Amino acid sequence: KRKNIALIPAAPKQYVEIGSKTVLEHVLGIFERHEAVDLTVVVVSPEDTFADKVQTAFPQVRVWKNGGQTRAETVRNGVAKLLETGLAAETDNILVHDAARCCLPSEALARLIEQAGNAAEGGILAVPVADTLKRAESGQISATVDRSGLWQAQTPQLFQAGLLHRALAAGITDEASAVEKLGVRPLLIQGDARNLKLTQPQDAYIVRLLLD
Amino acid sequence: LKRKNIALIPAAKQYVEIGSKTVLEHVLGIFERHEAVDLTVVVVSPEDTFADKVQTAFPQVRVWKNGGQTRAETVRNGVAKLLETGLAAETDNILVHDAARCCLPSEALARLIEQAGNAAEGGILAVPVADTLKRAESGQISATVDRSGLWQAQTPQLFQAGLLHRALAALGGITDEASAVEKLGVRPLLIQGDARNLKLTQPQDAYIVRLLLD
């Protein structure tokens, strides 16, 4: 009865060509082949050209053109529509995922759903900070900051639809940060080193190699 | 007579076969082929035996067997012995590198030598923290911590032999070499590292390491 719905804000090329497809197409395939995800939605801007062809290659994915002006606004429109549309109940789970984390391992997606799927507080994938951290002033170190109990967040970020809608309605960064402001403490679930984000050539070399 | 650049690798796993060489042999390979490095030393435990084999593949590398009971103690002994021996002068540079960071880009090494190699305060390779940071209480988020201006330290960490010997000799609640230098009131430079300069500590890493070398 309870569903798990993937939502991807994509309204900066997710249309870069690696292997035989785009980054986005590489992303949607990981969700489409996962048995535990019941539906995948992509929110693009009303002027996104390549979007129509993406829809054609993935007819069961809903490609919506109600992107806003910010990543925050485009996520807000996506969640609101799933609810108004009736496609998701207030108690179904929404997994918000970055369009550029196109190497997420299916086994880590399973962990996320298996461990935060039935928790009222939801959960995100994350990896413990393993290196010493430093604060910089103008190219110099002004201090060493304790890395005790610190984690770096990845995506997806899984939360009940009703809970997420409330939190995004109210200095926010990720979705968990808006959930934390309501008094809820989300779980931290082991992400993966392979789950990196495409935001620069160094990353790209590693992604391009992982996608082989 | 120019100021010298000496690599020091505390290695008392790094013997995980990859291709046709151990991780260690891969690491020695990066320094021995780099024009600006004048010497390379590896400090192992006296019990270590595979180290003898390493010595035969790298005749100019110095394999010392005065490892400590911890990484901090082995770095301390290597630096002391480099000075006591006369191989390093007080003002030569000591580049302290992890035995398991076998994918350090040659270009990254050059930048460190060029920028920190000529600054009395030394410097380290490091990358800015790009993802949102969270503090955990018992598997749950207890806070989001501000990442503005924050960096993750890598190796090598480059300091003058006399400044490094001084800083590691005696409070004690420190972590990397930079943090012992900072306690003296000195601020090391931060030089851009690289995403491939990762350390081999778990299977996820090994897959990426093996993949990056081919």
Curated annotation (Swiss-Prot), chain B:
<dbReference type="InterPro" id="IPR029044">
    <property type="entry name" value="Nucleotide-diphossugar_trans"/>
</dbReference>
<dbReference type="InterPro" id="IPR034683">
    <property type="entry name" value="IspD/TarI"/>
</dbReference>
<dbReference type="GO" id="GO:0019288">
    <property type="term" value="P:isopentenyl diphosphate biosynthetic process, methylerythritol 4-phosphate pathway"/>
</dbReference>
<dbReference type="InterPro" id="IPR018294">
    <property type="entry name" value="ISPD_synthase_CS"/>
</dbReference>
<dbReference type="GO" id="GO:0050518">
    <property type="term" value="F:2-C-methyl-D-erythritol 4-phosphate cytidylyltransferase activity"/>
</dbReference>
<comment type="similarity">
    <text>Belongs to the IspD/TarI cytidylyltransferase family. IspD subfamily.</text>
</comment>
<dbReference type="InterPro" id="IPR001228">
    <property type="entry name" value="IspD"/>
</dbReference>
<feature type="site" description="Positions MEP for the nucleophilic attack">
    <location>
        <position position="199"/>
    </location>
</feature>
<keyword id="KW-0414">Isoprene biosynthesis</keyword>
<comment type="function">
    <text>Catalyzes the formation of 4-diphosphocytidyl-2-C-methyl-D-erythritol from CTP and 2-C-methyl-D-erythritol 4-phosphate (MEP).</text>
</comment>
<feature type="site" description="Transition state stabilizer">
    <location>
        <position position="13"/>
    </location>
</feature>
<keyword id="KW-0808">Transferase</keyword>
<comment type="pathway">
    <text>Isoprenoid biosynthesis; isopentenyl diphosphate biosynthesis via DXP pathway; isopentenyl diphosphate from 1-deoxy-D-xylulose 5-phosphate: step 2/6.</text>
</comment>
<dbReference type="InterPro" id="IPR050088">
    <property type="entry name" value="IspD/TarI_cytidylyltransf_bact"/>
</dbReference>
<protein>
    <recommendedName>
        <fullName>2-C-methyl-D-erythritol 4-phosphate cytidylyltransferase</fullName>
        <ecNumber>2.7.7.60</ecNumber>
    </recommendedName>
</protein>
<keyword id="KW-0548">Nucleotidyltransferase</keyword>
<feature type="site" description="Positions MEP for the nucleophilic attack">
    <location>
        <position position="147"/>
    </location>
</feature>
<dbReference type="Pfam" id="PF01128">
    <property type="entry name" value="IspD"/>
</dbReference>
